[PDB]
Structure formats: C-alpha cells, structure tokens
C-alpha cells in the first residue's frame, strides 16, 4: 500500500518516493485508538458479566475492608443486568427514538402565529448535525472536524 496505511513486519506507516527507490516506513502498527461512545460500545459489548462477577466475588471476600467495599457497590449493578435483567449494550445509542407528533403538536394561533413544543427544535438540531455528520465524512475527512461535529452531535443527543 503506498504513502499510507501499510502493514509491515512491525512498523506502522509507509511513505514512498519514486525518485530513488526510497520507501520510508514509520513504525507504529494498528494502534486501536478511538473515542466517543464508539470506544465505550465495543468495551460494553465485550465485558463478560459472569466473569466480572466471579471476578469481584473473589475481589470482595478476600482483600482488606478497602477495595472490597468498591467491589460490592460495583457488583449489585452487575448482578442487576445479570439477574433476570437485560444485558448492558443497550446503555448506548445508535438509534434515537422520536416522540410522536400529536404529543408535540404544531399548532396554528392568532393569524401567522404558530405554536410548537420546544422539543421539535431540539430534534431538528440533532437531525441537521447527524446529517452534516455523514455528509461530512463522505466528502473526504479532516480529523479535527469529524470530531468537532461528533462532539457537537454528542451535545445535541442529550
């Protein structure tokens, strides 16, 4: 692969000059570095509950009265999903529900006067961002911006 993503013995990137057969190769392999809920999603989809539980059962009943108080407070929550609950992937969002229309009406008032729950405005916000997202990624992709937008988005989502 040239002037970019290239998997060698244990070196990362690879630049290329055709003047002299000079093929520089910086050395940092695929260092999975991410952020945003993208990072946390993976992590949430890989936590083997049963493990973590038996991890703290042993982490609880043995160490001193210190790090075992943290493990208890950290187990009840795990036991929560673990019991008849529903696994912890769900805490993330890749599909934001949308409140019905008539609950957040769009009314007509005194002449041009129109009424509408603020909610509609927060949604639009969210939509336009999420939409600028993809459309941004598509058209090439300078990093700073992709996050800036993902950041802004992250705000809108809440």
């Amino acid at each position: 692969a040239d002037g970019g993503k290239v998997k060698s013995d244990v070196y990362g990137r690879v630049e290329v000059d055709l003047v002299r057969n000079v093929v520089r190769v910086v050395e940092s392999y695929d260092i999975d570095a991410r952020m945003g809920a993208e990072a946390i999603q993976q992590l949430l989809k890989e936590l083997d509950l049963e493990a973590l539980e038996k991890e703290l059962l042993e982490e609880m009943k043995h160490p001193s009265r210190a790090r075992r108080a943290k493990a208890r407070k950290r187990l009840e929550v795990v036991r929560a999903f673990l019991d008849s609950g529903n696994r912890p992937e769900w805490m993330i969002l890749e599909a934001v529900p949308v409140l019905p229309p008539d609950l957040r009406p769009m009314v007509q008032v005194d002449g041009g006067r129109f009424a509408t729950s603020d909610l509609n405005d927060l949604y639009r916000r969210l939509i336009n961002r999420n939409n600028r997202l993809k459309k941004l990624l598509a058209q090439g992709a300078p990093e700073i911006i992709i996050r800036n937008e993902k950041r802004m988005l992250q705000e809108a989502v809440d």
Partner: protein, 52 residues
C-alpha cells in the same frame, strides 16, 4: 401513628448472605419468606443474619 411507624421499621440490613450480597438493607418480610424457603422447604439452611 403505629401504622405509619411500623413502616419506618420495615427495612433491615444484611450481614450473612446466600443469594445476594451483604450490605443491602431490604424489606423485613422479604426475608421471612426467603429464610422461610431455605430452612424448611429446601434444607441446607442459609442462615441470613439481618439487622433492624
């Protein structure tokens, strides 16, 4: 006033576990039931020591 007060004492802390971990504090009778099905119906008594 008793009716109400009794509600003020309808919770007890845990010490000796079996199903769920110790320091929890739950309804008083939600233990007169369990402790009731861990010593008589299904033996192998799991004495759940609680705290008013």
């Amino acid at each position: 006033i008793e009716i109400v007060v009794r509600q003020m004492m309808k919770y007890v802390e845990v010490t000796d576990p079996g199903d769920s971990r110790l320091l929890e504090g739950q309804v008083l009778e939600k233990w007169d039931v369990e402790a009731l099905n861990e010593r008589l119906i299904a033996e192998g008594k799991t004495p759940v020591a609680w705290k008013p």
